[PDB]
Design a protein around this ligand. Structure first.
Ligand SMILES: O=c1ccn([C@@H]2O[C@H](COP(=O)(O)NP(=O)(O)OP(=O)(O)O)[C@@H](O)[C@H]2O)c(=O)[nH]1
Ligand SMILES: [Cl-]
Ligand SMILES: [Cl-]
Ligand SMILES: [Mg+2]
Ligand SMILES: [Mg+2]
Ligand code: NA
Length: 327
DNA sequence: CGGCATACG
DNA sequence: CGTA
DNA sequence: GCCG
């Protein structure tokens, strides 16, 4: 078992679901308290279990696994012995955890805002609605649309949405393309949103594209919310339903075709996979990775990539398809 | 102990 | 600060 | 919280 998640296949479904979900509660709770290091260890421990070829049935099977020390091992031990971990249940039940979870789920609210509101005594969505003066326009939208946005987007929803985006993109710039990325590209059957990557085969033609796309979508009546030169858009989209419609989150990003492999890798995730891949690049290979490129700071040169495969090869890593990046 | 991914709106 |  |  290698120490970095980008060094091993992680499938979407696996053999240690209950154990990884318990560790991810502790990870989440760590984040709500601002402990990014603890969050990372619990996420990595969880992810290690996702990568195992069979269920953990005894504590000894943790020996030598990376990211399992005293704390994570005890969590697993208790689940194996009793079916529950007391620390985990205590977190689940706590007012702090439940309210930070509820508040950070709102589009436009992060940990810092949730925490402030929590300290101010606020606890429910209706608490927030009563004092609407204190909300940003983004948060107002997030709160109005919260019920719809809390329902999963279905894979079976995605194609219709992609078609609508393609129509607008084609008018904005003939020849421009739309690629499904994010969780659905990793094989998820549901998601919190739909993430699309846009480019054009002629380098440079994509400059100024996203505002054109957004204005067209808004003219079609499809945009319930968006922030408006830019290259990322975080929207709320109108998605048809039987006799009605629902709000869904849609992310759009534009990249030049030279950067497309880096953007595709970066947006396809998982989020933990990308963090680990970047950490690996920098700490093991001395190369700086982001969604735009891969930089050698000694030669002061960028690696040209024509494919994700190129990028894995330049990092000396075995290729992982998107389905195996579910760290 | 230091480090923990990296960027855009 | 928010967001991916 | 864990790794190197
Ligand atoms: O903090 C982040 C968030 C997101 N991302 C990158 O952006 C991608 C989409 O970010 P996302 O929030 O849409 N998550 P996703 O994996 O699609 O699952 P879901 O919750 O169902 O939408 C993620 O999969 C990462 O590749 C980051 O790199 N860092
Ligand atoms: Cl589906
Ligand atoms: Cl980036
Ligand atoms: Mg997504
Ligand atoms: Mg997204
Ligand atoms: Na939020």
């Amino acid at each position: 078992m290698p120490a970095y998640a980008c060094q091993r296949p992680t499938p979407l479904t696996h053999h240690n679901t209950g154990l990884s979900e318990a560790l991810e509660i502790l990870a989440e709770a760590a984040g709500f308290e601002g402990s990014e290091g603890r969050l990372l260890t619990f996420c990595r421990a969880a992810s290690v279990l996702k990568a195992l070829p069979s269920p953990v049935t005894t504590l000894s099977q943790l020996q030598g696994l990376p990211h399992f020390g005293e704390h994570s091992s005890r969590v697993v031990q208790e689940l194996l012995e009793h079916g529950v971990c007391e620390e985990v249940e205590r977190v689940r039940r706590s007012e702090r955890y439940q309210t930070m979870k509820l508040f950070t789920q709102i589009f436009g609210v992060g940990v810092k805002t949730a925490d402030r509101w929590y300290r101010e005594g606020l606890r429910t969505l209706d608490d927030l609605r009563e004092q609407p003066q204190k909300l940003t326009q983004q948060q107002k939208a997030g709160l109005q649309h919260h019920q719809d946005l809390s329902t999963p987007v279905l894979r079976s929803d995605v194609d219709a949405l992609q078609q609508v985006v393609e129509e607008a993109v084609g008018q904005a710039l003939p020849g421009a393309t739309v690629t499904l990325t994010g969780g659905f590209r990793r094989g998820k059957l549901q998601g919190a949103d739909v993430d699309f990557l846009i480019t054009h085969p002629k380098e440079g033609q994509e400059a100024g594209l996203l505002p054109r796309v957004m204005c067209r979508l808004q003219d079609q009546g499809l945009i319930l919310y968006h922030q408006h030169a830019f290259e990322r858009s975080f929207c709320i989209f109108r998605l048809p339903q039987p006799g009605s419609w629902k709000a869904v989150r849609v992310d759009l990003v534009v990249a030049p075709v030279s950067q497309f492999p880096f953007a595709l890798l970066g947006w396809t995730g998982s989020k933990l996979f990308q963090r680990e891949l970047r950490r690996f690049s920098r700490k093991e290979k001395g190369l700086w990775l982001n969604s735009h490129g891969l930089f050698d700071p000694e030669q002061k040169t960028f690696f040209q990539a024509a494919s994700e495969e190129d990028i894995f090869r330049h990092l000396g890593l075995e290729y992982l398809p998107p389905e195996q990046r579910n760290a």
